[PDB]
Amino acid sequence: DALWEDRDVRFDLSAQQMKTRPGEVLIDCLDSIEDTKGNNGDRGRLLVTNLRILWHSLALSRVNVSVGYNCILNITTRTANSKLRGQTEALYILTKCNSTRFEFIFTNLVPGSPRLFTSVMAVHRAYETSNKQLRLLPQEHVYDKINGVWNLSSDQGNLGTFFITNVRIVWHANMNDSFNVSIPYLQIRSIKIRDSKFGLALVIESSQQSGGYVLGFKIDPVEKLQESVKEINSL
């Protein structure tokens, strides 16, 4: 139960269906599959999304466990069924990180979902495929252009150029090497201003990374630090 996310209590389900996360898009959903090497029984439903691939039970759906695209390495098919009551059904499981293996056997689907496999190749693929002009992500735009910022690293600080985007909040330095320093907004948890410490700066409280990245704005009369904290606390 190390990559089974909890659903009965942590997703607060009824007796029949899952609970959808914000921004989670559904494509297909089916039934009558077997799980092995979890902590479960023998039969239940099967749901899929753009962030999780979900097994709903049949008997006791107050035990219902799944995993998503954050942990899957690659996926397999069996073959196209040659003749006389075969199937195309194969769900075989490659964990990215841990040594747990799984086999998903649809117990009684009659064509075994040959067209759901035509979908599931692309939805893993989207999670696969993910001078100062930004390497811009799709569904992302630039909302501020700031020249002359002294980001002060643990090594040293230098002349730089800052951008404020929708998601990937990056910083460029034009000091002889074209640095890449980029954080996403979802890794940002909280923000504080440091006017006195290190000269009119902001510090970044990261949850997962557990580190702090600063910038620098005492280098010019800038009138943009109060512009900054509004955009980044909102978005």
Numbering used by the authors: 5 to 134, 149 to 253
What does the paper say about this structure?
The BBSome is a cargo adaptor that recognizes a diverse set of membrane-bound ciliary proteins. It binds with its cargo to the intraflagellar transport (IFT) complex, a large heterooligomeric protein complex that is transported along ciliary microtubules by the molecular motors dynein and kinesin. We recently reconstituted a heterologously expressed core complex of the human BBSome, comprising the subunits BBS1, 4, 5, 8, 9, and 18. Here we report the structure of the human BBSome core complex at an average resolution of 3.8 Å for BBS1, 4, 8, 9, and 18 and 4.3 Å for BBS5.
In addition, the resolution is limited in this region, indicating a high degree of conformational flexibility. After three-dimensional sorting we also resolved BBS5 at a resolution of 4.3 Å and combined its density with the reconstruction of the full data set to build an atomic model. BBS5 is composed of two PH domains that both interact with the β-propeller of BBS9. One of the PH domains also interacts with BBS8 and with an unstructured loop of BBS9. In the BBSome core structure, the PH domains are laterally rotated by 90° to each other. Like PH-GRAM and GLUE, BBS5 was shown to bind phosphoinositides, with the highest preference for phosphatidylinositol 3-phosphate (PI(3)P) and phosphatidic acid (PA), which was suggested to be crucial for ciliogenesis. Besides BBS1 that indirectly interacts with membranes via Arl6, BBS5 likely mediates the contact to membranes by direct interactions with phosphoinositides. Since the BBS5 and Arl6 binding sites are located on opposite sides of the core BBSome complex, a simultaneous membrane binding of both motifs would require a curved membrane surface, as it is present on the inner cilium wall, and/or conformational rearrangements of the complex. The observed dynamic properties of BBS5 are probably the prerequisite for the subunit to be able to reorient and position one or both of its PH domains closer to the membrane, thereby enabling interaction with the membrane.
